Structures are given as C-alpha cells and as structure tokens.
Amino acid sequence: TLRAAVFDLDGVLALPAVFGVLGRTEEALALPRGLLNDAFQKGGPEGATTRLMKGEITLSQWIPLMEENCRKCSETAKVCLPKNFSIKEIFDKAISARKINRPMLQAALMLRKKGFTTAILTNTWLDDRAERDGLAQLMCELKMHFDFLIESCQVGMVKPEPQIYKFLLDTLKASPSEVVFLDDIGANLKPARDLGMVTILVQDTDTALKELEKVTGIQLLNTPAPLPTSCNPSDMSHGYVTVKPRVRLHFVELGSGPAVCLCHGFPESWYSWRYQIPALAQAGYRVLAMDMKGYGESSAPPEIEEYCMEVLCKEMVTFLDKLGLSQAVFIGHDWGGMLVWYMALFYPERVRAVASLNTPFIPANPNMSPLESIKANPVFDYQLYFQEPGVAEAELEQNLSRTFKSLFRASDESVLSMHKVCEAGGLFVNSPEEPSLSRMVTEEEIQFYVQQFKKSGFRGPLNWYRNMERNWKWACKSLGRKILIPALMVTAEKDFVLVPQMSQHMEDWIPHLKRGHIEDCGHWTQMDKPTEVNQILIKWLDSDAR
Amino acid sequence: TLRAAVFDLDGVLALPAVFGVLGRTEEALALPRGLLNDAFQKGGPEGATTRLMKGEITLSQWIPLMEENCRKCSETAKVCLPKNFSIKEIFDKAISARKINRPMLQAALMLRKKGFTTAILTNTWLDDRAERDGLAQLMCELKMHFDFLIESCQVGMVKPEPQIYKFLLDTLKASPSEVVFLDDIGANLKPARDLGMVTILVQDTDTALKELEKVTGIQLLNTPAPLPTSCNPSDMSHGYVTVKPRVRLHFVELGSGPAVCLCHGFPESWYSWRYQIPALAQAGYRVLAMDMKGYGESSAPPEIEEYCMEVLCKEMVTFLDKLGLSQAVFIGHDWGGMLVWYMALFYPERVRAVASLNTPFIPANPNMSPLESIKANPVFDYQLYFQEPGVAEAELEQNLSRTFKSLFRASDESVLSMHKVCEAGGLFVNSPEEPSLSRMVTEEEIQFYVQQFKKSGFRGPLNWYRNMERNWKWACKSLGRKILIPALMVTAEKDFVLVPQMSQHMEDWIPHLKRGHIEDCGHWTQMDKPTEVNQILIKWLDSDAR
Ligand SMILES: Cc1ccc(SCC(=O)c2ccc3c(c2)CC(=O)N3)cc1
Ligand SMILES: Cc1ccc(SCC(=O)c2ccc3c(c2)CC(=O)N3)cc1
C-alpha cells in the first residue's frame, strides 16, 4: 500500500511551467519551431544545461552559455535573431509569472494530513540573478508543506538519471511500491515506473488529481475549502524581551516587512493567532504574536496595578524600544483590542496602524464610574464576578481542560450560562464536567492552552479586569483627542458580549475608520472564521499599513 | 555636589530648533515680524498650543487651530497670507530637518559614564501625522541614552509650570542642588534656578558645554572620539529557533529593514558584534546576531560531523526557513566568514549580499589534501594542535578568564606564542597565568565570554576545525562556480593568521567584489576597530544590500 507522494515543481506544483516559455517565445517571435528548446538542450548530459542542473555552474554563468547555443542553433536553420532579444529577460519573466498550483498543493496537504510522507523532487539551478528573491520566496512558501525537498543542483544528480531515484527512495525510507510519483515530463517519469513506483503524467491538474485520488483512495478533488496554515509551536522562532526588572515579554516571530504586533484577549495566548501568523507573513509582513503580560511564557506579577492599561501600554512601548522598532501595526482581540485603541490614543507616533477584532472603541463617561456603567448591561455581569481576588482563579484553575473546552466554542455550541453568574454562585454552574469537543478546536490545541496556563494560572489574566477605576481615570485624559491614524474595526455578528452595534458611534472619534464585518462569527473570531479574518486583515494592511 | 543632568530636546539635544522655523518662515515670506510666533502662542496657557503640549489634543487636531490663530493674527496687522501657504507643510519640513545635536549627546553620555543620572525634559506633542515615524525614529534613538524621558504631553504638565519641576526632582530622587538643567528658553529655565538647580542657557552648543564642564568638573568639550554604542545583554531581544530535534539556534535581534545576519568566529559570541548591532539597526537594518552552533545559548552537540560546513550551512538555511525570511545579508568573521562564503556559493538564492571580515575566499585545491595545505604554512600550526579531540579543550577550559584575556588582545599586546604550539606541547606555554587587561576589553566583557563558555566549553567550537576533509570534498563541488551576488571583503592590516595578501586572487572567483581595508587592525576586527567596521559595513550595505 501507498504511503508516500512525490511531486515535481515545474508543471506540477508550479504553473505556468517555465519550460513552456521556450515554445511561447519562438511562436511570439515567429522563430523556427523548437529552436529555443534545441539551444536549451545542446550537448545533452555533457552540455551547459546538465551542468547547471547538477550544480556545477550557477544560473548567471549559464545565461551566456545558452546564448552561445542560441547563435549555433540559428546558423544551421538559416535564421536571424533580433537585437532586443535577451535570454535573461525571457527567463526573468517566466520565473516571475510562475505561481503555485494551489489545487496540487491542497492535494499534497490532504495526503500529508492522512499520514503520507510527501516530497518535492525537481531539476533546479543555483539562482544568483539580481531577481533571485522571487523564486526564494516561492520555494520558502512551498517547502514548509513537505517532509522533503530534493533539488538536483544540491544533490548533484538529475532526472532522469537512475541515481536520483534511488536517492529519493533512500530519503523516503520506503519501497518503490509505497510511492506515487507525479511529473509533467514522461521521460523523467519512466525510471520511477521502472522501479515499480506508481506514476502520474501531469498535463492538466484536474485529470492528474483524478488519477491521484483513485490510486490513494483519498478524496483530493472537489473537497471543502481548507483552513489556513496553522503554527506548530516547536517550529516557531521564540522571542524574549525584558521590559523591566520583574517583567519579560514572550512573542512568536515570522516574516519580513513592516512589523505587525498581534495582541490576544482573555484568557488567550499567542497561539490564538495560529491561523493568522503564516498568512500575514506570506502577505509580506513581519508578525510578532505576543504572549501578553500574565500569559504563557511572559511574566505574570501578582499585583493588580501591574495590569492597568497605562502600565500595559508603557511596557508595549518599551518592547518596541528594546527591539529597535520605531513603529508597529497593532492588531488586538478582546482585551488586546482595548490595549490597541489606547496605544493609538496615547502613543500615535509608535503605531503605524491600529486594528481591533470585536472590541469597539468607547470613550470613558467622565460623569459615570465604570462600576455603574458595567452594571447597566447584564451581559457584563461575569466581569463583576471577576472583581474579587482569588474567587474566579479558583474556579478557572480547578480543571484547565474543562475551562478551555467550555470557553472555546462557536455561537451554536454554548455550554456556559453567561447570565447571573454572581446569582448562580459560580461560572461553571449547570455546565458539563466533560464538555464535547468544539468543531473549532482539536484536543491537541486545547492541551496547548492547558500547558500554557499551568505556569501562572489565572491571577495575571483576571487582573486585566481589575483596574476599572485606574483605566477610567487614565482614559478621561484622552477625552479631547481623536484617532486620526489608519484604523480598522472588525465586528463579529454572533459575539453576544462585544456586539457589533456597540461600535456604531466610533466614527465620531475615528472619522476615517475602516470596517470589516464577519457573519455567523462568535467571540473567538480568529479560530471561528480564520479565512475571512485573514482576507480582511491582509486587504486592510496592503491598502492602509503599506 | 551635582549628580544629575537634565536636557531639553528642541534647541538642546536636537537642532535646528523647531521653534526657530516660525522666525525663518516670516522672514522668507517677508511677513510682519513675529506674526507666526503670535499665532503659535495665542491664548497663552488657555490656548491651542498649551492644550497640545499637555496632551489634551493631538498634532493633527492642532494644525487647523493654529491656522485659525494665523488668520486672526494677520487681520489685525493688516496683511495677506499666500494660497500655497500650509502650516502642516512648514512643520513637516522643520521636524524633518531637526537632527540630533551629537556634541550635546556625547556630553550627556560622558556624564552618565561618570555616574550621573541623565534625563530629557521637553514640551512635546502627540504626533499622529502621516510622517510621524521620522520623529518616532529620532526619539527612539535619543531615549536609550538617558535614564529618563519626561514628555509634557504624557505627563499632562508643561514647562514653565512649577509642577513639572517637582515631578522632575521626584523622578530623579535628587535635591535641586544635585541637578544641572539645560534649556534654550530662558523662561523655562527660571523655575529650575528658583528651586536652586544649576542652570545653563543654551544658545551655541560650544559655550553651553564650556558652562557644563566647569560646573561638573568633567571634560566634555574636545574629548577623544567615543567608541560606538555597545549592547547590554539583558536589554536585548533574545531569539530561539529549533533547526532540528537536538539543535536550537540563539540570536540577538535589533532594528527593522532588510535582515542582516552576523556570524562570529572562533572562540567568540553574538557579543563579538556588540559595537555593530546598534549602529547597523540605526542605519536601517534588522540585525540578527547569532550564537553560532557550539556557542553560548545555541546547542552544542558533541559529534565532530555536526560542525562540517555542509551541516552548518543547511542549518542556517532552516534558520531562515523557520523565521520566514526568504533572504538575509550574511556578514561573517573568521569561521563565520568561511561559513558566509559557502552560503553564497551553495545557497545564492537565500543570500541578499555577502561580507567577510579577515577571512578570504580561497577555492579548494582538488590535487592537495587540506592537511598538506595547512602544513605548508607555519602560521596555521595551532589548527593541527586543535585536531586531537579533548587536548585543546583541556587547556582552553582550565581557566576561562586566562583563555579570553590572553586571546582578546590588540596587534601590539600579544602574550601567546602562536608558533610551534605542537613543538612547545601547549597553547599556553610561556604565557602569563594572569594576563594584563587588553585596551580593547573591560573586565565585565571578558566575564561575559567566561559565563557564556561555562555551558558547553570548547568541544563544539573546536569541532569547526575538525572537518578539514569533509569541508574540502564539499568545496570541490563548487570549483566551477563564481560568486556573482553583491560581495565585500574587509582586510585587517595586522592580522598575522588571516593576512590581507591571502585575499589577493579573490577577484578571479568574485569579479564584482568590493573591498575595505583597516590599517593597524588585528584579528578581533569588530572590537579592535569598531568605528571603521561600522563605517565600511553601513556604506556597503546602503549601496549594495539596499
Ligand atoms: C465563565 C467565563 C465567562 C466569561 C469569560 S470571558 C471570555 C469568554 O469566555 C467570552 C467572552 C465574550 C463572549 C463569549 C465568551 C461568548 C460570546 O458570544 N461573547 C471567561 C469565563
Ligand atoms: C592558543 C590559541 C591560538 C589560536 C586560537 S584561534 C583564535 C585566535 O586566538 C587567533 C586567530 C588568529 C589570529 C590571532 C588570534 C592573532 C592574529 O593576528 N591572528 C585560539 C587559541
């Protein structure tokens, strides 16, 4: 039985095939048929192209050798080449236009999800062109999705030589009969078939995928829209900044470009942005996903005042100071959203742009104390139960797995009675001891949050709700200001605490505010609707955050 | 006696003073004298400007209020303002042209070096302009050099109100008689003098500095060229990437912009780039200063083969893969330099540009084994003593302080006999047990390297020299290639192992190679000549690495 799938890059995982450019070029330039492909294949396994693919020479060294083969191929067929003609120009465009074959990637991902060992096997070159980054970016993206990437120029062997195939079996630690091999070049397909491997000639993706699904017995074609790429914690770059003697801040970092700082809510983690981190990095941003003060690998001092908004924001400014960042885009959810609006108001110089998921910006009422204000809405009663130190800590820390499984659920999966929690005398009253697994989460993900909360518990997290009065007084200083820097408000239709209607007057304080709205989305926005969140964020970042 | 110095920003630490723009504008536009300054100061402590400086309103909200005051100031004096006239345009240019007053910064740094508590006290605003980053960048740079930064808009108090002064004493935890206060506005100077503080009216920097040196008793004017800013390890952002199950890589990170990856030599540390990290970040780069495999907080597996060049380079590619970086500029010294040339040769796609300090690129001789090659030069005899496992480890680990103090010395400070170490039967033969402190290093810096080498010792570091044969075979695959990506070779005049002449033929393999040369510079290039290294690197990065 099959347990490994192998794919070529050109014509299989990446389209349009770079080899096809020779054919299009001669047709566009009305040149003799196959003239470009003959110059490209001159000398066979002794010629320029084989040397390049084995890694003997770099692409920049090969460019003039291919041109010499082009003048030799033209003089025989009695033809003239134009003066505007450049081989580098032709290849630059072909490499630049070659994009990932998404349905083929999805199929490769689905096979790996189902236990298959996957690999890319390609005839490639050492790219030293001034424009090499384009391909480095494509390869970097593609490679993370496979167990192995075998490149001809790195192994010094080429397809169709039999050595590379034996090297491929050796890497996969599998018998040829356990391997499906996909290629667009019949010649390169032959030696794999010869060893007894299952082969697929790839012409059109759809047919190749039909051949793949019948041979693996797994549905790969027409399957549902897959979730965005997530994060495996152990494969991330983990960063640590000391902001003051007793306070260190932890973050996960991915990508290059403008710094985007992601701020989670209560009782969350950097992992809460797992579906946004690869997506935002791929979109051209440097993502810094925080473990906010009180959470995960970040310090959790006991004192209530360590979690007032003023202190939290000053510490976030020091975080940028110590990392040498003059600015960052700040994107927050729930308590992170509140932090992010106050970063925009108090430190507009350090905030490139501001975005909030679910959390609206509501100016403090200087006439009404926040305890009065919170009491006026029955949906905010849980926050009053959070006030007394040690009480909610006790309940939420008793069974970590039950806590997260009960919390992290979609709009139609509610198990916790969010009303009259003070009257009921408990947050977990009339709730299962063993809740069902929400469709949003896996057992492993819940267990990641469980392990994270084992270090400091709920004291620091709950303290974020225990500075209602300090936060109110601090907020009153900002009453005459407006948020005039780029801003995005994203509302979640089915969040019954942070309701979309609560954001209705924000235009009065943020006139140029931009918006997004997600239908059928609960409180846990990022994992409830990851695809839409990424769509809205990337669209807004590219237009407003540069 | 004086123990604290306080400086204003505008007109003191930053020039040309932004307040002076009002005067230049009216003179250039041939407008009534003081017209701009009257509109700027309209309503006094009740008007627009005071509100802005206290933080009641942001700069963008103030812009139209100042314009309203400009139409009111012009109608009284019977004058017309042009149609091309914009207040925002005037302030944008004034903020943009305002640069750091380097001699004033040097003086502030020298006072802090001598035990003074230093602070910036300024009347500033909440900057929310599209161009706010310019000032955020200036403030971020300036602030790191002081114990405190008190901003009017953040504290909600302004100069000359007496409250801010009492707030300043409170922050400094010092009596007014212990404080020197520097300001360009006599009015803002008055309340400090009134409390008994030492004051300095700042008109021209030179005179202000003369007044400062006589009052502190420390030479601040005409003093020698200071060393570049260094790194305090505890204030850095520390990053950790797992490249394989048993291998994690540690790095220090600072700045934004293109990623510059710094690779140290033997037996060094990320700290070896201490003088380059702030300088390169300030120059517009994202610096990643590595703890190379075998060093510091990075993993140090015991096996010799874990340190062959192929493995080291593959791990550096995975480092970029896990951080989500398609490329980095690679800058290396000694063994890091060798790694960096092999990164350019084997992975040109992932290398934006390559730079080496001291280490030349020499192609492998396919006819001569590296043991023969190394033997041909008597300066390389220490490398033969490094070959036998456990021998050099024993000597170098016996006294860590003696090891580093003996090694880290300038060209005229040599204490170790580098010749016939095998014949002498020891690396430390006829060398002091307690060497003098080199002028390049402080006791604290040596002790940082001592603490770093306490975790894994010298086995992993020495293993870099123990793959002569594997490295040679691997290098032979690259014999037909050329380095065609941007490249810099920096030679050190007095390095007697890695001599400048050894780099003489590099143009044959790197035709577009760029060069730098540092005279009177030993092996430890970065700490021997930090200023010149930074000059050469920044100049090359800005022209060749974008
Ligand atoms: C028992 C309990 C109740 C509330 C919280 S706060 C975080 C939370 O669970 C939550 C917040 C807002 C919200 C929902 C859950 C569901 C919803 O629609 N809005 C924590 C523990
Ligand atoms: C005892 C000993 C000898 C050599 C080394 S290698 C690093 C080193 O110390 C060094 C390398 C090159 C070099 C100098 C020192 C001085 C110089 O001019 N070139 C380590 C320990």
Q: Is residue A218 within 8 Å of A110, Cβ to Cβ?
A: yes
Query: Which residues, at least 6 apart from B389, have a Cβ–Cβ distance to it below 8 Å?
Result: B304, B459, B466
Rounded to a whole number of angstroms, the distance from the CA of B432 to the nearest CA of chain A is 39
Q: Distance between CA A268 and CA A272 in Å, rounded? A: 6
Cα angle A109, A112, A115 (rounded to 5 degrees) comes to 155
Residue A242 in contact with partner chain B when CB distance is under 8 A: yes
Looking at the CA of B264, which ligand is closest?
2
Taking only Cα atoms into account, the Rg of chain B, rounded to an integer number of angstroms, comes to: 29
Decide whether any atom of ligand 1 lies within 6 Å of the A416 Cβ: yes
- A430 within 8 A of A480, measured Cβ to Cβ: no
Q: A338, A357, A374, A382: which to mutate for ligand 1, most atoms within 8 A of CB?
A: A382
Q: Determine which residue's CA is closest to atom 5 belonging to ligand 1.
A: A382
A68: part of which helix (H) or strand (E)?
A: helix A59-76
| A417 contacts chain B (CB < 8 A) | no
Which contiguous run of DSSP H or E holds residue A240? Answer: strand A237-244
Q: Record the tokens describing residue B349, joined without a space.
A: 């796609």
Amino acid at B22: L
Tell me the domain boundaries of chain B.
Answer: 1-16+97-217, 17-96, 236-546
Asked if B160 contacts B199 with a C-beta cutoff of 8 angstroms, the reply is no
CB-CB under 8 Å, A482 with B327: no
Find the angle CA(A67)-CA(A63)-CA(A152) to the nearest 5 degrees. Answer: 125
Name which of B127, B253, B258 is nearest A323 (Cβ-Cβ).
Answer: B253
Q: In this structure, which ligand is nearest to the CA of A266? A: 1
At B488 the three-state DSSP class reads strand
The beta-carbon contacts of B432-436 under 8 Å, at least 24 apart in sequence, are: B432/B402, B432/B406, B433/B399, B433/B402, B434/B402, B435/B402, B435/B405, B435/B406, B435/B409, B436/B405
Quickly list H helices, A144-276. 152-155, 162-172, 186-195, 205-216
HEC assignment per residue over A293-348: CCCCCCCCCCCHHHHCHHHHHHHHHHHHHHHCCCCEEEEEECHHHHHHHHHHHHCH
A83-88 long-range Cβ contacts below 8 angstroms, 24+ apart: A85/A29, A87/A63, A88/A63, A88/A129
Q: Is A505 a catalytic residue?
A: no
Residues in chain A: 546
* Phi, psi of B149, deg, nearest 5: -135, 115
Strand partners, A489: A356, A515
Q: What are the pocket residues of ligand 2 if the criterion is a CB atom closer than 6 Å to any ligand atom?
A: B 266, 382, 407, 416, 418, 427, 495-497, 522-523
Question: Which residues in chain A have their CB less than 8 angstroms from residue B485's CB?
Answer: 128, 132
Grouping H, G, I as helix, E, B as strand and the rest as coil, residue B357 is strand
> Do B512 and B209 meet the contact criterion of CB atoms below 8 Å apart?
no
User: Is the Cβ atom of A380 under 6 angstroms away from ligand 1?
Assistant: no
Q: What is the dihedral of CA B427, B431, B437, B439, to 10 degrees?
A: -80
In Å, how far are B105, B166, B203 from B221, measured between CA atoms?
Answer: 12, 30, 16
A346 touches chain B (CB under 8 A): yes
Where would I find the H helices in B347-387? 370-375, 381-385
Q: Please, which residues bridge with residue B241 across strands?
A: B249
Ligand nearest to the CA of A427: 1
Of A338, A309, A358, A353, nearest to A470 by C-alpha is A309
Supply A58's token pair: 């770099």
- Return the residue whose CA atom lies nearest to atom 12 of ligand 1: A497
| Binding site membership of A240 for ligand 1 (Cβ less than 6 Å) | no
> Between the CA of residue A235 and those of A260, B291, B292, B318, what are the distances in Å?
20, 18, 19, 10
Give the tokens for residue A304: 């209530």
Which is nearest to A50 in space by CA: A129, A128, A125? Answer: A125
Q: Which amino acid is at A35?
A: L
Cβ neighbors of B71 (< 8 A, separation 6 or more) are: B81
Q: Is B263 left (phi over 0), alpha (psi -120 to 50) or beta?
A: beta
For helices A133-143 and A87-97, angle between their N-to-C axes, nearest 10 degrees: 30
Find residue A329's DSSP bridge partners.
A260, A353
Beta-strand runs (E) in B320-436: 328-333, 351-357
**HEC-encoded secondary structure of B38-106:** HHHCCCCCCCHHHHHHHCCCCHHHHHHHHHHHHHHHHHHCCCCCCCCCCHHHHHHHHHHHCEECHHHHH
Q: Which of A378, A130, A114 lies closest to A220, judged by CA?
A: A114
State the pairing for strand pair B99-100/B14-15: antiparallel
Is A480 within 8 Å of A401 (Cβ atoms)? no
Which of A334, A381, A495, A544 is the catalytic position?
A334
Largest Cα–Cα separation, chain B: 95
- Dihedral sign, Cα of residue B318, residue B320, residue B325, residue B327: negative
Protein residue closest via CA to atom 6 of ligand 2 = B266
SS3 content of chain B, % helix, strand, coil (to 5): 45, 15, 40
Is the CATH number 3.90.1300.10 carried by domain A236-546?
A: no
- CATH code reported for the domain at B17-96: 1.10.150.240
| CA distances in angstroms from B304 to A143, B374, B473, listed in the order given | 29, 19, 16
The 10 Å Cβ neighbour count of residue B543 is 12
- Residues of chain A with C-beta less than 8 angstroms from the C-beta of B342: none
Name the helix (H) or strand (E) containing B198: strand B198-201
Q: Among candidates A243, A268, A241, which has minimal Cα distance to A253?
A: A241
Question: Alpha-carbon distance B240 to B228, whole Å?
Answer: 27
Q: Note the resolution in Å, 1 decimal.
A: 2.2
Q: How many whole angstroms separate alpha carbon B452 and alpha carbon B268?
A: 9
CB of A111 within 6 A of ligand 1: the answer is no
Helix ranges, B123-257 (H):
133-143, 152-155, 162-172, 186-195, 205-216
Whether B500 and B493 have beta carbons less than 8 Å apart is answered as yes
Report the first-to-last Cα separation within chain A, whole angstroms: 50
Read off the amino acid at residue B287. Answer: V
**Residue written as token pair 């009492």:** B166
Phi, psi of A143 (to 5 degrees): -55, -35
**Residue to mutate, B272, B396, B418, B441, ligand 2, most ligand atoms under 8 Å from C-beta:** B418
Task: Could you list the beta-strand ranges (E) of A111-202.
Answer: 117-122, 148-151, 179-183, 198-201
The catalytic position among B38, B127, B334, B528 is B334
Smallest CA–CA distance, residue A79 to chain B, in Å, is 33
Instruction: Indicate the angle between helix axes A391-398 and A400-407, nearest 10 degrees.
Output: 90
The angle at the Cα of B123, spanning B120 to B126, to the nearest 5 degrees, equals: 105
Q: Are B333 and B356 in contact (CB under 8 A)?
A: yes
Active site residue A523: yes
Nearest to A146 by CA among A116, A114, A166: A116
Residue B424 CB neighbour total at 10 angstroms = 14
**Token pair 């690998």 in the structure block, residue:** A297
**What is d(CA A17, CA A10) in angstroms, rounded to the nearest whole number?**
5
Amino acid letter for position B217: G
CB A268 near ligand 1, within 6 Å:
no
Question: In the structure encoding, which two tokens stand for residue B190, read together?
Answer: 């008055």
Residue A466: count other Cβ atoms within 10 Å of its Cβ: 19
Distance of residue A138 Cα from the nearest chain B Cα, in angstroms = 9
Is the separation of the CB atoms in A446 and A248 below 8 Å? no
Per CATH, the number for B1-16+97-217 is: 3.40.50.1000
Q: How far apart are the first and last CA of chain B?
A: 50
B543 contacts: CB under 8 Å, gap ≥ 6: none
Q: What are phi and psi of B94, to 5 degrees?
A: -60, -45
Phi, psi of A144, rounded to the nearest 5 degrees: -60, -25
Distance CA B297, CA B315 (A): 16
Contact A183, A202 (CB under 8 A): yes
The single residue listed with the structure tokens 């002028």 is B439
Tokens of B542: 């800005």
Specify the DSSP class assigned to residue A10.
Answer: B
Residue A16 token pair = 């349009």
Q: Can you tell me the distance from the alpha carbon of A224 to that of A187, in angstroms, rounded to the nearest whole number?
A: 34
A266, A497, A520: which to mutate for ligand 1, most atoms within 8 A of CB? A497
- Whether A1-16+97-217 shares its CATH topology with A236-546 is answered yes
Closest CA to A543 of A521, A504, A518, A515: A515
Cis peptide preceding B461, ω within 30 of 0: no
Q: Tell me if B286 and A234 make a contact (CB, 8 A cut-off).
A: no
Number of C-beta neighbours around residue B342 at 10 A: 23
Q: Tell me the residue length of chain B.
A: 546
Q: A320 and B140: CB-CB below 8 Å?
A: yes
Contacts of A298 (CB under 8 A, 6+ apart): A247, A248, A249, A250, A290, A291, A292
Other Cβ atoms less than 10 A from the Cβ of A131: the count is: 12
Give the Å distances, CA to CA, from A76 to A35, A72, B251.
Answer: 10, 7, 58
